[model samples]
Target: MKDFSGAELYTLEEYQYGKFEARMKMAAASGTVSSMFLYQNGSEIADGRPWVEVDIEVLGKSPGSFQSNIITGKAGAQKTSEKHHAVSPAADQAFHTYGLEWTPNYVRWTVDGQEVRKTEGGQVSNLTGTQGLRFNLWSSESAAWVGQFDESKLPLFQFINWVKVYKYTSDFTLDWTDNFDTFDGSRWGKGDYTFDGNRVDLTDKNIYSRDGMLILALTRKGQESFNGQVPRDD
Candidate 1:
């Protein structure tokens, strides 16, 4: 079994429709996934309202590209449309700005302010439930999708410089922006859970803000810890 422990950050409030942007440097090393997604807050009804999600996921295998997906539909029969997009200089090699614009009809994914993919029709247009912005760093058990788990790359970290969320009505209304100078407990929460097919348990202890950035880390089971000290410039 892989001895991995990971970290996640998510919003406290579920947003209805929004435009979001995040500047981040992805974690290096194959088999891991560093992602930003919008997932339903799970305020389920008696019959269930279906699961809704929009993903901007970066698999550690091909460092120069990432995936965009829209998942929706009811419990038994779910539908997902996935598209892969490429970026220059690779994802882990440098920082990049990622964006998502979600409205009633379509979801547009962007990198560095340029549109990469736009999804609509069918379930994509029907994702009406409220969702919270989520970010996670974890290893995957699905080798075909992400690659084989590499234990040698323990203690990998993903750096997020800033994130912005805007409520979209007829136009964009700025909701909030976290520069990550400090941890805002009112706006965000660190996760303490794991899902099936994931190789790590998301532990709150691995998330922290330092030097104006939010960092999520993945390490060997007992090494899931954080240090507040920033490196000194030589």
Candidate 2:
């Protein structure tokens, strides 16, 4: 198969506690992964410190199945909890809304307005500080993981209908929103990610922002460059 190309879009601002929701349709194909997640930027490989991340990942090999997970802690020491959910209509066949609520005491996941999983209290580390919202689509190099990459499926796409975020106090209050009416670079980071150990070459060619929606496509290989903002300071 040809080398893979992918797209990623992320919030420029970090948020502390909030409810995050998105309407998305996964790409259908083997060896492809589509994701929406909340993340803090430290890396266990480079910084010796762990970062916090909550994820909603779609396995293209199984269009009806998706996974929700959380990772916390530092370097060699970390904790993770993950669970898989099955959708009736198949995620790739139609758009479905997914939600994640993160507060001081609990983290919850919902699918199409129904709660499917929750991790709370001492079971998971309450993420401190803030995190950025991210959406990404990429091909996996591991055949055993998501299955073999089918070059015939050359270009696959993932679509985000919209995204909304609300801060949590005694009640949720709207904090930020993106309907993708236009590409707001001031609020988002696009193009290739600069971090180390990334497997795919991220380029603007595979990422399109227009038509009231943000589209991330996986296509043939290409590399584009630009400096990315450092997520942390030493």
Candidate 3:
């Protein structure tokens, strides 16, 4: 058995409703999961904070498509709403724009500025808590869900160009944007943690930035200062 290192970048503040968008190029390898999501850390029982998440995950096994999911409730009895949507040119090949619009009435997902999926009713109504924005790249043990793991494929990576946000009160208004020119200590931080079922530990060492992008690596312990789109995938 081998140990792998992954990384997570998340916002310090959490928000309720917003139009969250990002332009990303995902890692290519089975068992890998590259994601941008809104999450809360807690449990199911009447103990800690409630659990909730809205995810835009690109599974390496299915690079031609990505999963749009909403996980609510918590722990053992968590509720999940997941679906697969096809994207042209595959998710690992090029940088594609994605957006998740969460509101009181519904949750909608868009790919390259076009709406691909939307959900309302029960599962959508369950989103009542604020969640911090996160971008993480990790390997998984879910053979059926994410696919098989291969340590030989270590040092895989995902690159994010920029992130945009629009708050929702009476209208979807612009809030903030991060072009990733430099790490903003006041707004974001790296995660040195991991949860069960995941095959990698999230270490701060695996995260990097260059030119105008944020890069998250899944490596076999060690790993640039890469910049521009010329050698984007290295």
Candidate 4:
């Protein structure tokens, strides 16, 4: 089994505070760990002086269990809020909606519209200052640093139906509307877009282009595809 380890990046139109919603199914493979995360990092490898992260991790060992963590940083020092839920029996049985509502002062995590985790103060990752959001879904077999994962299990899987990012305005609303649309393979205003099955690598190729007209790019099969098309810069 191939080890699937990689990160996906996206650019969001200027929106400081907002809500994020995801409808996903968990990988059925046992002993696997899957996660959905919202992150902001100063560097591509998730390094740097400023960063914020919020995650929902599903652990196969715990069955219907999931863990949530929110953290923020400045100049390297990071603070975090951690919570654990035994939603296992209920979560493993079917697909569910996992959401996060983030603001300058606080953050909340929910499952199926019900609040499952909440944090504030030094715990919530402050996104008001210089920051942009990145969403990722990844799985690892070894425990790595967490000491909670086992590798003998080989390969595992994670599934995501859809992801929506919202920006916080004076009066935020959750009403579903068909008016919201994303360009073919692109979201958060148009740009060079990509949607490779395993990884997405998008860039703003045209500097003077309208923010809404940005292009979308993606890479699937280890640099084999980009922009909903096959093959690389070739």
| Candidate No. with top lDDT | 1
Looking at model 1, residue 216 earns an lDDT score of 95
Q: How do the candidates rank by TM-score, highest first?
A: 1, 3, 2, 4
Model 3 C-alpha lDDT versus the unseen true structure: 0.82
Question: In model 1, where is the ten-residue run with the lowest total lDDT?
Answer: 225-234
Residues 1-234 of candidate 2 have per-residue lDDT tens digits of: 235677888888878879898988778688777888888865346466556888888876888988888888765677777789997678877788888889888888888888888888863555777888888887667777677777688677777778999988736888888887788889888757533333466666666765567778777675322122211101
**Predicted structure 4: lDDT:** 0.48
Strongest candidate by TM-score: 1
Q: Estimate TM-scores for all models.
A: 0.92, 0.86, 0.91, 0.60
lDDT of 4 at 38: 66
lDDT of 3 by residue, 16-60 (tens): 989988888888688899998887655334564556788888888
Residue-level lDDT of model 1, residues 1-234, one tens digit each, is 345789999999988889989988888578989999998866223266787889988998877899899888765567788889998868887788999889887899999989999877787777886889999999888989998878887788888889999998746788889998999999999998887789899988889788988989998998876674543212
What is the alpha-carbon lDDT of model 1 when measured against the actual structure? 0.85
TM-score of 1: 0.92
The model with the greater lDDT, 2 or 3, is 3
Q: How many clashing pairs per prediction, in order?
A: 0, 1, 0, 17
**Model 3 regions more than 4 Å off:** 43-49, 223-234
Checking candidate 2 for backbone clashes, the offending pairs are 50-74
- Worst window of 10 by summed lDDT in candidate 2: 225-234
